[PDB]
Amino acid sequence: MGKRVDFSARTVITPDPNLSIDQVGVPRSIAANMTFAEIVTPFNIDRLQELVRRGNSQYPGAKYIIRDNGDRIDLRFHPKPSDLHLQTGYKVERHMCDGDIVIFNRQPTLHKMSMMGHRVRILPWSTFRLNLSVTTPYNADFDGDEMNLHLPQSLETRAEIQELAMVPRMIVTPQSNRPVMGIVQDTLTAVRKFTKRDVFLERGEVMNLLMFLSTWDGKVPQPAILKPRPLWTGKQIFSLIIPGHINCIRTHSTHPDDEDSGPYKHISPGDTKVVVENGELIMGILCKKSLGTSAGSLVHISYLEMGHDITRLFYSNIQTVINNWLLIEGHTIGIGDSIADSKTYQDIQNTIKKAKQDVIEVIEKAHNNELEPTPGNTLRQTFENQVNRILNDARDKTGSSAQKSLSEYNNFKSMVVSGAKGSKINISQVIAVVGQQNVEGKRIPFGFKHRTLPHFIKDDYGPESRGFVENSYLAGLTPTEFFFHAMGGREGLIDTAVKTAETGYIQRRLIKSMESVMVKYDATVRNSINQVVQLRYGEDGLAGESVEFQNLATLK
């Protein structure tokens, strides 16, 4: 059920925004080592002859001539001129060339998207180059990751891989009726900044961006502003990037809840409420919730309306054009993004001190037997629960204060609203308060005799003793907080390193249970024994990659 396979390679993976999503970059050494057997025909007789005369030394060549009788000619060393000649029945194992179909794989292989078919693009250096958007299905990154590239050796295998496992065909998962690929960090932040209402591109900038649009008719759109100077908006360029005439209505991550209630519903003051009409981005700022893996997003609507090839070109055009615009705009991160204002610092301090005073009040009430337990809980249970409630309220309030203090130029906020990376909790921990460190769901245990650390007094249930990191990452933690945070990180690492074996066993058991279940030609679902399990697949008889969420108009 598993064995070493010939015609495979493994190298470190490296980002390549200039490759299409269905394209993979292969080092020339791997292509020279691998071969594919091509049957000689009068159509390709000349090219095959050129390859064999070139030989195994030069990369665009071959090292084997397989005669119809069976004997193999090894062209690596001393190619005899007599047996160099080849006929129609022969086949020659030529080196891997551009456009060859290869199946790319990353371990561990969890879903079927963990193995996709890619088109070979020979590149100079010595790594596997992969487009950034095809990363998410592979659960990959570039801190030393490696991938396995298997090369089919037969025409039928190549054709079936092309017709089933191509990356464009693997965009939408039947697991959750949603795209597995979307827009990733840099392009996502860049499109969020690009589709803002106040983005204006000059003539040369627009032409340079259009040089990177594959599906461009060659007509420059009329600028959104003609006088006093011609200017194109980012929404116009992205409208021309959008394929076909797909319609879509989405929402940005900063859209207020009352905007759809009061006036200006259809004219957003904040440039939220993404609307695409006839393939044109009429209004709105795009983010993860419009260019990501969520169901109903722009890429999902594109895949459902147009084809997989059109969606593939959509992904590639988005990445390339907005990367070239980021080359002009820019994006960074640094200390200045982690600094709040003096008033905000004051607010943080107020939230903290007040919380400490409240916890002291709870401790005094507990010591005076004035704390009546809540039903269903013990007195220490009630005491802790309310202490943790106070601390969590303080942490949430200080995080909200940090978010309010954040300005429109903050890179933390930019990468968070774009959905590329980070979160409100990360901003809060960087700026205001790291928060309570918890071990096994409770506070730091009394490892010593009624003491968390020997620097405290016995029976001290204050926030500092039990592991409430009062400082932020920017300020720096006191050593007791450092030790408590180390405990928390150790717990996270323990969970990560422990759960894997159980999860893998569960996956193996599920697949060995269901592995032979298949949809039959009478549209029934039967197992190997032929025992019916579902008269109709999914009780309706539909695949999972073609359905979508809808609303029933007569129920409510």
């Binding site: 193995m115 010595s126 820019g330």
Partner: protein
């Protein structure tokens, strides 16, 4: 400070004091600058990753014939250092170079934990290093039936002779220091007397795809009293795409691309960063210590000092650093106005830049690349070998077959598990179902069980299945192959 009388008395009965709070850290954790501004898993990752950092592992490396040794060209002590490093002796034996790091999005090749290295810096020696590999070989005279000797093999006497070149040796069967030896090249000429006549070649070749240079060789006698040889082969490894680098705060990545100096962004002064890292790496990992170290590095480079990144120290904070940085004509937050190298236009967002200590991990792509196309196979089963060192293929395991099953690629599954792994065929008696004794040359097929010579069929199936069925037969089970 905790002994001073305050408005509210917490303890007031202290019996001991710590010499310094930073003593709770270890050896690979004291290298971290500003560890209290980092997330704990990042501290653990750096503690594990410092042991992989590349530098001068020992002063007397010219005499130590270790099997593997990576030595950096130009190690530098960090501009931002901790006080524990003085006792750690990391200043005397550093394992990294202070690099001008611009945290920016540039051309998209630094995405997802990837770095952009300045090509011109690499041509100048930036993170260049040497790789040392030692080969051992001894002549054993344990028995007169087969004895080894160091001699130059000739094609007219030796049997096990490869296609490699044997002219690189001296008459003592040894290579001399200072000879460029490529992959599959002879460095030790050893012939053992046969029981292609009276001597079988047992030479030791160079490692695959090395193309190094013989550094020095050492001839001696071992405990048993026989000749002992050690050969050190030196190879220079310029940093390139696919090489792993890390900061001191658990920020690892491979080299996405190498741009020349004219291609890199630059400040008003001609400062092209040596390394560009993605801004997206920080918010998820909360490595604020990385940014503080960059700021302190800029301050220290401007001031001509070595910064103090002791973990718990109120004397130094980010703001002070900013003030000191602003006193040297720079933005207090460390941002700079960069200019696009391709177009020369200003970059709209001012870019964070500054010196940050970086390490070159021992993870060189050159030791991870491997491809297979019909190489050697095992002996128990006719399946491809294991390990790039033995030219073995990749494993198409149970999860891979699982995903291909979900795909429905039956022909690809058959190609992977049977055609490209271990194609095999066997003759089976149609009645008994047991493998039949069939001669290909004379086409006389027999089955000693059923005593038949006509009802024999040919079935194609993996060698592993044949071995499994033969093992079951040896276990008294009779798996009968019925093709009717």
């Amino acid at each position: 400070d905790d002994l001073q009388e305050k408005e509210v008395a917490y303890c007031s009965t202290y019996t001991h004091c710590e010499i310094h709070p930073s003593m709770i850290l270890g050896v690979c954790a004291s290298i971290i600058p500003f560890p209290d501004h980092n997330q704990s898993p990042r501290n653990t990752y750096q503690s594990a990753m410092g042991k992989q950092a590349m530098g001068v592992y020992i002063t007397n490396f010219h005499v130590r014939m270790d099997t593997l040794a990576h030595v950096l060209y130009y190690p530098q002590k960090p501009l931002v250092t901790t006080r524990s490093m003085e006792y750690l002796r990391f200043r005397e034996l550093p394992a990294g170079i202070n690099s001008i790091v611009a945290i920016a999005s540039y051309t998209g090749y630094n995405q997802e934990d990837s770095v952009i290295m300045n090509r011109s810096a690499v041509d100048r020696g930036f993170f260049r290093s040497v790789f040392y590999r030692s080969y051992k070989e001894q002549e054993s005279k344990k028995g007169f039936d087969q004895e080894e000797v160091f001699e130059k093999p000739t094609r007219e006497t030796c049997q096990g002779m490869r296609h490699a070149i044997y002219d690189k040796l001296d008459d003592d069967g040894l290579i001399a220091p200072g000879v460029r030896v490529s992959g599959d090249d002879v460095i030790i000429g050893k012939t053992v007397t046969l029981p292609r006549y009276t001597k079988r070649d047992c030479s030791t070749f160079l490692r695959t795809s090395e193309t190094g240079i013989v550094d020095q060789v050492m001839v001696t006698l071992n405990q048993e009293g026989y000749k002992f040889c050690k050969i050190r082969v030196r190879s220079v490894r310029i940093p390139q795409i696919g090489d792993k680098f890390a900061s001191r705060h658990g920020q690892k990545g491979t080299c996405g691309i190498q741009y020349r100096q004219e291609d890199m962004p630059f400040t008003c002064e001609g400062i092209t960063p040596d390394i560009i890292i993605n801004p997206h790496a920080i918010p998820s990992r909360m490595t604020i210590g990385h940014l503080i170290e960059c700021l302190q590095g800029k301050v220290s480079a401007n001031k001509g000092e070595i910064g103090d990144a002791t973990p718990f120290n109120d004397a130094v904070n980010v703001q002070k650093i900013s003030n000191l940085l602003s006193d040297y004509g720079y933005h207090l937050r460390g941002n700079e106005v960069l200019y696009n190298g391709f177009t020369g236009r200003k970059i709209t967002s001012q870019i964070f830049i500054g010196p940050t200590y970086y390490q070159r991990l021992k993870h060189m792509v050159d030791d991870k690349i491997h491809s297979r196309a019909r190489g050697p196979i095992q002996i128990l089963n006719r399946q491809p070998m294991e390990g790039r060192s033995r030219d073995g293929g990749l494993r198409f395991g149970e999860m891979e077959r699982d995903c291909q099953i979900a795909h429905g690629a039956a022909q690809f599954l058959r190609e992977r598990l049977f055609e490209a792994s271990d194609p095999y065929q066997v003759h089976v008696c149609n009645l008994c179902g047991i493998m039949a004794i069939a001669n290909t040359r004379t086409h006389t097929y027999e089955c000693r069980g059923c005593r038949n010579k006509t009802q024999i069929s040919l079935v194609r199936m993996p060698y592993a299945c044949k071995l499994l069925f033969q093992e079951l037969m040896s276990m008294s089970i009779a798996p009968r192959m019925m093709s009717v």
